[PDB]
């Protein structure tokens, strides 16, 4: 017997509805809550203000153990590159200066790059992460001394050995095939890519 | 030398 | 209810009273069971 | 010409009110039995 | 080829946890917490994002028409360097299409007395709250499972 | 000047007594959803005091 203190008992089985619509009067309880951490009101008596209810308990007889099949609905606007997912973040060890006067050798560092959030294709991403490597180069690497041939992290998608002739030992079209095979990376001496705190290693 | 590539 | 005009929204605060007991029980050492009531609005005879 | 600022004593509240989310169905309490489930404390945002 | 796997690009290695702390009694080993990162999970799912596929055979003659129609060489800053020039685009793409997820989780117990104002949370795998969920709808269907008395 | 109010038709069973009293909003302290964005006062919240 699903005893509700106002109406007659509704014996047997029923349905409780927890809907995302705490927008009428239960919105002084969900001020700091989102559509995923909210406080509904499962009491739908259409004679009490949504707040005058929500102080009335649904009571099923206590001589029995009550089960209930939960069946849920859920939408999402979640994109690709958002930060919550930990996408849009990667670290790269990238040259900051050719011939550091202290050592006469290049000086590499560990910069954390950040792509603009939003839902991108699989290419526009790998071009947005190339537009961050070649966008920190403009501020740390331009005015410290490094040729564009020193950019040492380039997310490429070719199979660079297409044309490679074993006899001659080098590709013999005079160019790379520019046909996408896989997102692979292309590094240089010292430079690297760290995906520990990141999640682009999946995308 | 036969560089099979057409060129 | 009828009150005179002030210029700052006020809010009447009626207190419809009513019994409001709670009867904690404590059976097996370790459990407390509570069973409230409020009788002009009703709640958990739980 | 000049003068004082007012007083403006700040300070806590009788019986320390506010500090202890007391009736709010959200943030609330739970003097239950560790080894169990149900909280012996349900307040129903009506009581103050 | 020993410590790296060459899988296909992607969208979903994260489950979603439903918490109804005030309706369903905790599952077998979840202690009844009151903290959005310690709620007793009630039903787990996979995020409602399945990677639609796409096949554009050209796929790079389309990437040089989004470079002449982009008014700018901001994505090809080295058009001549064969190792720093705008990697091509795979023919086979994988877009993300968030679809609705009407799931049916089987029976699990209830609480004798259900309050009026109810909590509903949908936490990610590390138990934060996914801010990109804009619907959430529980539908509970009480049933009597057993008898506490005799 | 007047505040017509109506309590939804219900059981009204041992009601001891009404007991009104006024209060002003600026001081009405939301309550619920800690951090009521707007309780901009400090008064002497006569609702929880």
D16: which residues sit within 8 A by CB, 6+ positions away? none
Residue A104: phi and psi, rounded to 5, are 60, 25
In this complex, whether C and A touch, counting 3 or more CB pairs under 8 angstroms, is yes
Long-range contacts: C13-16, Cβ < 8 Å, 24+? C13/F20, C13/F21, C13/F22, C13/F23, C13/F47, C14/F5, C14/F18, C14/F19, C14/F20, C14/F21, C15/F18, C15/F19, C15/F20, C15/F21, C16/C40, C16/C41, C16/F7, C16/F15, C16/F18
- The per-residue DSSP string of chain F comes to ------PPS----S---------BGGG----SSSS-S-----S--TT--
Resolution (A): 3.8
Output the six-digit token pair for A112: 């954390």
C-alpha A127: how far from its chain's center? 17
- How far is residue A17's CA from residue C32's CA, in Å, rounded to a whole number? 30
Give alpha helix (H) positions in A44-141: 122-128, 130-136
CB neighbours (10 Å) of residue A177?
Answer: 15
Tell me the torsion sign for CA atoms A26, A28, A30, A31: positive
Query: How are beta strands A16-18 and E43-46 bridged, if at all?
Result: unpaired
Q: How far is D44 from chain A (nearest CA, A)?
A: 5
Region of D40 (left: φ > 0; alpha: ψ -120 to 50; beta: rest) is: alpha
**Interchain CB distance below 8 Å, C46 and A59:** yes
Instruction: Identify which of F1, F16, F21 has the shortest CB distance to residue C13.
Output: F21
Cβ pair C37, C19 in contact under 8 A: yes
Q: Which of A41, A194, A188 is nearest to A112 (CA)?
A: A194
Cβ pair E121, A30 in contact under 8 A: no
User: Subunits with at least 3 CB pairs below 8 A relative to chain B?
Assistant: A
Q: Which of A66, A55, A68 is nearest to A6 (CA)?
A: A55
- Structure-determination technique: cryo-EM
Give alpha helix (H) positions in chain A: 122-128, 130-136
CB neighbours (10 Å) of residue A181?
Answer: 16
CB pairs under 8 A between A and F: 26
Residue linked to tokens 């909210």: A38
**Contact status of A28 with chain C (Cβ, < 8 Å):** no
- How far is residue C44's CA from residue E116's CA, in Å, rounded to a whole number? 10
State the DSSP code for A124: H
Q: Which of E36, E43, E37, E35 is nearest to E18 (CA)?
A: E43
Chain A positions in Cβ-Cβ contact with residue D45 (cut-off 8 Å): 29, 51, 54-55
State the DSSP code for A171: B
C-alpha distances out from residue E2 to A96, A188, E5, E106, F17, Å: 31, 21, 8, 41, 80
Cβ pair E110, E140 in contact under 8 A: yes
**Interchain CB distance below 8 Å, C33 and D32:** no
C-alpha C4: how far from its chain's center? 29
D10: which residues sit within 8 A by CB, 6+ positions away? F42
* A3: β partners: A59
Sheet holding E113-114, edge to edge: A2-4, A58-60, E113-114
Cβ pair E23, E118 in contact under 8 A: yes
C-alpha distances out from residue C26 to C31, E6, E9, E31, E110, Å: 6, 61, 58, 20, 22
Cβ pair A64, E147 in contact under 8 A: yes
Chain F positions in Cβ-Cβ contact with residue A6 (cut-off 8 Å): 10-11
**Residues preceding gaps in chain D (C to N > 2.5 Å):** none
- How far is residue C44's CA from residue A121's CA, in Å, rounded to a whole number? 53
CB neighbours (10 Å) of residue E122?
Answer: 24
Residue A35: phi and psi, rounded to 5, are -75, 5
Give the E-state strand segments of D1-48 in sequence order: none
- How far is residue A75's CA from residue A18's CA, in Å, rounded to a whole number? 15
**Contact status of E7 with chain D (Cβ, < 8 Å):** no
């Amino acid at each position: 017997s699903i005893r509700y203190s106002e109406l007659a008992p509704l014996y047997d089985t029923t349905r409780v509805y927890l809907v995302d619509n705490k927008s009428a009067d239960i919105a002084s309880l969900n001020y700091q809550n989102d559509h995923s951490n909210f406080q509904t009101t499962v009491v739908q008596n259409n004679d009490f203000t949504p707040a005058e209810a929500g102080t009335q308990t649904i009571n099923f007889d206590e001589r029995s153990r009550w089960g209930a099949d939960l069946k849920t609905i859920l939408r999402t606007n979640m994109p690709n590159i958002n930060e919550f997912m930990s996408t849009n973040k990667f670290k790269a060890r990238l040259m900051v200066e050719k011939k550091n006067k202290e050592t006469g050798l290049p000086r590499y560092e560990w910069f954390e790059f950040t792509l603009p959030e939003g839902n991108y294709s699989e290419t526009m991403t790998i071009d947005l992460m190339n537009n961050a490597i070649v966008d920190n180069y403009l501020e740390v690497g331009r005015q410290n001394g490094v040729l564009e041939s020193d950019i040492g992290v380039k997310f490429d998608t070719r199979n660079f050995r297409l044309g490679w002739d074993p006899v001659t030992k080098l590709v013999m079209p005079g160019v790379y095939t520019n046909e996408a095979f896989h997102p692979d990376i292309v590094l240089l001496p010292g430079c690297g890519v760290d995906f520990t705190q990141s999640r682009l290693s999946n995308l | 030398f036969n560089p099979v590539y057409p060129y | 209810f009828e009150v005179d005009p002030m210029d700052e929204p006020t809010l009447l605060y009626v207190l419809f009273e009513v019994f409001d007991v709670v009867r904690i029980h404590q059976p097996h050492r370790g459990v407390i069971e509570a069973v409230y009531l409020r009788t002009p609005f009703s709640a958990g005879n739980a | 010409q000049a003068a004082p600022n007012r007083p403006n004593y700040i300070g806590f509240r009788d019986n320390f009110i506010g500090l202890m989310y007391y009736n709010s169905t959200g943030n609330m309490g739970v003097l239950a039995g560790q080894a169990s489930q149900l909280n012996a404390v349900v307040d129903l945002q009506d009581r103050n | 080829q020993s410590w790296t796997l060459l899988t296909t690009a992607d969208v979903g290695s994260q489950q979603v946890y439903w918490s109804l702390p005030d309706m369903m009694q905790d599952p077998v080993t979840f202690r009844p917490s009151t903290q959005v990162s310690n709620y007793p999970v009630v039903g787990v799912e996979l995020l409602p994002v399945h990677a639609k596929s796409f096949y554009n055979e050209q796929a790079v003659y389309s990437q040089l028409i989004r470079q002449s129609t982009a008014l700018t060489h901001v994505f090809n800053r080295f058009p001549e360097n064969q190792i720093l020039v705008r990697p091509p685009a795979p023919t086979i793409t994988t877009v993300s299409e968030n679809v609705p997820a009407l799931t049916d989780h089987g029976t699990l117990p209830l609480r004798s007395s259900i309050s009026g104002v109810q909590r509903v949370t949908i936490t990610d795998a590390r138990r934060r709250t996914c801010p990109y969920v804009h619907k959430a709808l529980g539908i509970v269907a009480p049933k009597v499972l057993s008898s506490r008395t005799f | 000047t007047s505040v017509p109010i109506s309590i939804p038709s219900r059981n009204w069973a041992a009601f001891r007594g009404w007991s009104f009293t006024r209060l002003k909003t600026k001081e009405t302290p939301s309550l619920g959803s800690g951090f009521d964005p707007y309780f901009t006062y400090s008064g002497s919240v006569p609702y929880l005091d």
